[model samples]
Target: MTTLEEINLLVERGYYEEALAKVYEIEDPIEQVQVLTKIVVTIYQHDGPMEWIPSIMEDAMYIAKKLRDPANKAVAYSIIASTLAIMEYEEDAMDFFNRAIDEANEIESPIEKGMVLSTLAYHLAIAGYPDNALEIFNIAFDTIIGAETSYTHKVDGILRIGDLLEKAGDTLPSNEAMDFYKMAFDIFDKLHVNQRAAIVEKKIELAKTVYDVGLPQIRAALLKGKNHYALAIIKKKYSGVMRLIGELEVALWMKRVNNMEYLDVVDKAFECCESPRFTDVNVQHIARLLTELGNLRRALKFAKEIQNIHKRSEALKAIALELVRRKKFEEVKKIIESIPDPKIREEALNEIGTIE
Candidate 1:
């Protein structure tokens, strides 16, 4: 009479015996295996290591081995394998994972085989064996590609691989993830899956936009092409002070090709001046960008407006350094003298002295 939900609730409440009694009442072997998996997880989560865990896992494997279908058996084994991995039973977990793969290979349906293999690969990845996971994922990917399933399942499987590749890319170098995303996008595009294609397109754009590569790397991108596409992507992804800084980078890059085109970009940078927080940071980026554009007069004016003594001092020091490089030691000295903190003023002068 007990439902899986009632048994799950009992496990959550730490009534392990009561949950197991209810699981035994279930007629289906698959259902018993699923409930046993939950029971194993709940016990380990509540208490790190327990003597009863091994017995409970043994019960799960006993039930999983009795499963009539290979697909269901593979999934059941994977579930127990992943749970055992979480509990630090490495050798047993690996054995179960291999058995799961063997059962998955016995699946006659390509769609079912692909699904089972991908699930096992994901579990292996979580268990800290991504190299093994990647090899299995490639097999799953090929199975999915040749799956004679419905249009919806095919697209869904392809997208799933794309997502897994992107996650796996976190541990890899290069644009291998982007390659899968583009592949998924092209499939959707050709099929006229407009909404799905649009989602994948945004992912592609995000992948294409370089982040945290620093402005010097972005400028390197600029040097290769006069296009503002990367900057435009930055503007969309960032906000407030960062957006303004990205705009200024675009403006400076544009100055190399067409002088007048950068003017509107500068105007947009000024438009994003307001900051609900980090107000001084707002002005610091603006003044620094102005200095980079060779407009030192306006740059100095903006730097002076920052009320944060640290930020203002740093901004002024940057301008002073620029002037020092131009051999305008007198102007640099004047800027250093204007610093409100006598301690920072001394440090600034000492740094400028080294440049001299």
Candidate 2:
């Protein structure tokens, strides 16, 4: 094992004295703090003896304060700040956090500055200051926007802010999440990062429907034969082959009400299946989606078109299992026979037997 792993193993085994000694053996203050942070986190998580924490943390802070490079100093302080936060030393955590930001602001590299601020924001959020985290995120957004760096760095920073906002959606309020997603969507769209823009658009719609609008609203819309509304909503939420999948879902529901328009929806999705953009995985999904839409012939056809033999077999097997669910034993048998992999074929046979 490497020195770090060995030292951590010692720490895990309650060898605190030895772990501390080994930590001191590391020459670079940065590497030393790295190991010290891991050890601090480990001790905190496992409820190890707290008495040793103060001295260890003091040594770490000492090392961090002396670090030369502004970016490294920022990171070191961030590390100590987060460790202190995790250990419930709120006062110390804020002190280190402020120090880290001071160091981060001194960083001339746009990407580095954005990274430090992003990490700091994340730590602040987890440490029970989400509002403060949002403020920091705004500053990070500004920092990235004011980038004096290369084209790729600006794009990466913008995407980083988008990623951070998306992650915050899980815990933050829906309205707040929607606002963040819309900002990310607008930025990506303006930058002409079409694929990322589509994903952020999906996030915005998901936040709206799943949060503000709610699922029952969509369900109620569907029940009122407002299939077009459902179609339009799904269209906004997905793109490329995934949009076809979403459309197929609404189409299946429409067919349940005997809407002949379901046929047109299925036809549109089927045409998309032939697009060059349809990956092997996409074909597999289309194969499954067609099955749900109750077009076994088209389903089987799409399954056969998957170039990866294993994926083809799995898709065919899924169709066979779906057929079993419908009690279409004859169709199930045919699909099971068509699966190219013997292992998946055997598994499918056994599963069918279980039903009988």
| lDDT by residue for model 1 (1-356), tens | 45888887776676777877787888877678767877777667877337767788889889898887998898888888878887788998999999999999899878778878887876776666666777787789789788777777876776666556544433322243444455556656765668877766655443344323223334344545544665656666677666766676567656645557677777766665674354676678678778877668778988999988888988888888788777766677678889888888888888777734
**Candidate 2: what lDDT?**
0.75
Task: Name the regions of candidate 1 deviating beyond 4 angstroms.
Answer: 26-28, 147-356
Lowest lDDT 10-residue stretch of candidate 2: 208-217
- Strongest candidate by lDDT: 2
In order, the Cα lDDT scores of the candidates are 0.71, 0.75
* Number of the top TM-score candidate: 2
Query: What value does the lDDT take at residue 79 in candidate 1?
Result: 80
